[PDB]
Design an enzyme around this catalytic site. Structure first.
Site, PDB file in Angstrom:
ATOM      1  N   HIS A   1       3.943  10.861   6.716  1.00 56.09           N
ATOM      2  CA  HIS A   1       3.341  10.615   8.040  1.00 56.09           C
ATOM      3  C   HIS A   1       4.391  10.001   8.948  1.00 56.09           C
ATOM      4  CE1 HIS A   1      -0.973  10.494   6.245  1.00 56.09           C
ATOM      5  NE2 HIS A   1      -0.531  11.736   6.522  1.00 56.09           N
TER       6      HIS A   1
ATOM      7  N   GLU B   1      -3.232  13.682   1.627  1.00 62.47           N
ATOM      8  CA  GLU B   1      -4.434  13.217   2.297  1.00 62.47           C
ATOM      9  C   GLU B   1      -5.156  14.429   2.901  1.00 62.47           C
ATOM     10  OE1 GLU B   1      -3.486   9.533   4.645  1.00 62.47           O
ATOM     11  OE2 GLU B   1      -4.463   8.801   2.833  1.00 62.47           O
TER      12      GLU B   1
ATOM     13  N   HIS C   1       2.116   9.132   1.279  1.00 63.44           N
ATOM     14  CA  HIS C   1       1.002   9.004   0.345  1.00 63.44           C
ATOM     15  C   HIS C   1       1.295   9.915  -0.845  1.00 63.44           C
ATOM     16  CE1 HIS C   1      -1.488   6.976   3.475  1.00 63.44           C
ATOM     17  NE2 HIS C   1      -0.740   7.750   4.258  1.00 63.44           N
TER      18      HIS C   1
ATOM     19  N   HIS D   1       0.807  -1.214   0.000  1.00 63.71           N
ATOM     20  CA  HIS D   1       0.000   0.000   0.000  1.00 63.71           C
ATOM     21  C   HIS D   1       0.846   1.271   0.000  1.00 63.71           C
ATOM     22  CE1 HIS D   1      -2.555  -3.129   2.026  1.00 63.71           C
ATOM     23  NE2 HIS D   1      -3.366  -2.708   1.070  1.00 63.71           N
TER      24      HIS D   1
ATOM     25  N   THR E   1      -5.716   6.580   8.461  1.00 62.90           N
ATOM     26  CA  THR E   1      -6.347   6.882   7.182  1.00 62.90           C
ATOM     27  C   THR E   1      -6.381   5.665   6.258  1.00 62.90           C
ATOM     28  OG1 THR E   1      -4.311   7.605   6.120  1.00 62.90           O
ATOM     29  CG2 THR E   1      -5.565   9.266   7.354  1.00 62.90           C
TER      30      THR E   1
ATOM     31  N   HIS F   1       5.937   6.859   6.506  1.00 58.63           N
ATOM     32  CA  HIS F   1       5.585   6.427   5.158  1.00 58.63           C
ATOM     33  C   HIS F   1       5.048   7.668   4.437  1.00 58.63           C
ATOM     34  CE1 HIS F   1       1.939   6.062   7.530  1.00 58.63           C
ATOM     35  NE2 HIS F   1       1.365   6.552   6.443  1.00 58.63           N
TER      36      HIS F   1
HETATM   37  C1  LIG Z   1       1.426   2.791  11.316  1.00 59.13           C
HETATM   38  C2  LIG Z   1       0.728   1.611  11.188  1.00 59.13           C
HETATM   39  O1  LIG Z   1       1.242   0.593  11.661  1.00 59.13           O
HETATM   40  N1  LIG Z   1      -0.336   1.849  10.614  1.00 59.13           N
HETATM   41  C3  LIG Z   1      -1.083   2.854  10.014  1.00 59.13           C
HETATM   42  S1  LIG Z   1      -0.336   4.384  10.109  1.00 59.13           S
HETATM   43  C4  LIG Z   1      -1.700   5.016   9.262  1.00 59.13           C
HETATM   44  S2  LIG Z   1      -1.693   6.666   8.850  1.00 59.13           S
HETATM   45  N2  LIG Z   1      -1.898   6.743   7.715  1.00 59.13           N
HETATM   46  O2  LIG Z   1      -0.697   7.212   9.229  1.00 59.13           O
HETATM   47  O3  LIG Z   1      -2.657   7.030   9.289  1.00 59.13           O
HETATM   48  N3  LIG Z   1      -2.587   4.101   8.983  1.00 59.13           N
HETATM   49  N4  LIG Z   1      -2.229   2.866   9.474  1.00 59.13           N
HETATM   50  C5  LIG Z   1      -3.088   1.666   9.314  1.00 59.13           C
HETATM   51 ZN   LIG Z   2      -0.344   7.637   6.273  1.00 58.67          ZN
END
Ligand SMILES: CC(=O)/N=c1\sc(S(N)(=O)=O)nn1C
Ligand SMILES: [Zn+2]
Length: 257
Positions: free
Chosen positions: A116, A103, A93, A61, A195, A91
């Site tokens: 993020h 986002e 997006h 993803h 998210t 990570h």
């Molecule tokens: C950080 C992790 O283990 N999971 C995440 S971090 C995330 S986010 N996008 O930062 O909101 N979404 N999810 C499912």
């Molecule tokens: Zn994220």
């Protein structure tokens, strides 16, 4: 399984994750004129000098850079937070085009990508316990805009070839996440959610006002990743962002006036 394609993208998530239609979902649009300056808010305290990166992983993803979080190495404190939050991973997006990818939006403006930095509240002892708590996570969000290269990002960009498909990982040690921060730490904050699924509502979002700039070439390398695993049909990893969700009963606060 869920993803970002037309048959399994965000508008489908609620069938498997009904909290998708919850009261404190993320991301949201930040209306800068209705955000409230709150002088009770403290400066952010980012202490990343002892950070230890371990690995970079393509999880199908996004790609994640993972850190050792078994001790208070890299922590976030201050701002609207109580207590100490440990960095576990970061990570991005991003979009298929430079005009989309983030986002959060700011007065409906979209950025090319969003970073993020995910942190969990040490009082809950481990990440999996923390995501069950309304104050369990703090995510630092930083916008990317396209312009001049970001030298501190190039180590990341250079390894992406070695984790092109789902499930690939590579050793990624001695990466200093301080090289990814803007000059100013002014921010907006609001209570929200993860998210991507499971979309748990356990996050204090801290979104920095100042974007960082990256070059066209750097973001283009993001776009060469694959959602698919090796051997499968190539599907380029692009537009892995969730659209803005209704703010509902929430107030966005600003640390600056
Ligand atoms: C950080 C992790 O283990 N999971 C995440 S971090 C995330 S986010 N996008 O930062 O909101 N979404 N999810 C499912
Ligand atoms: Zn994220």
């Amino acid at each position: 399984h869920w993803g970002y394609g037309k048959h399994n993208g965000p508008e489908h998530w609620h069938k498997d994750f009904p909290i998708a239609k919850g009261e404190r979902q993320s991301p949201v649009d930040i209306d800068t004129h209705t955000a409230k300056y709150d002088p009770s808010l403290k400066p952010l305290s980012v202490s990343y000098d002892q950070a230890t990166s371990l690995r970079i992983l393509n999880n199908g993803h996004a790609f994640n850079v993972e850190f050792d979080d078994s001790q208070d190495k890299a922590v976030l404190k201050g701002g609207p937070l109580d207590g100490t939050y440990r960095l576990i991973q970061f990570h991005f997006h991003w979009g298929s085009l430079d005009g989309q990818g983030s986002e959060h939006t700011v007065d409906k403006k979209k950025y090319a990508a969003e970073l993020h930095l995910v942190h969990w509240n040490t009082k809950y002892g481990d990440f999996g316990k923390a995501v069950q708590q309304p104050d369990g996570l703090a995510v630092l969000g930083i916008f990317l805009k396209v312009g001049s290269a970001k030298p501190g990002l190039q180590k990341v960009v250079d390894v992406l070839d070695s984790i092109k498909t789902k499930g690939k990982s590579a050793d990624f040690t001695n990466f200093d996440p301080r090289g990814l921060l803007p000059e100013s730490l002014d921010y907006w904050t609001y209570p929200g959610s993860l998210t991507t699924p499971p979309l748990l509502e356990c996050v204090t979002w801290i979104v920095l006002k100042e974007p960082i700039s990256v070059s066209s070439e750097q973001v283009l390398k993001f776009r060469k990743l694959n959602f698919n695993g090796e051997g499968e049909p190539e599907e380029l990893m692009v537009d892995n962002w969730r659209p803005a969700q209704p703010l509902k009963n929430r107030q966005i606060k600003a640390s600056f006036k």
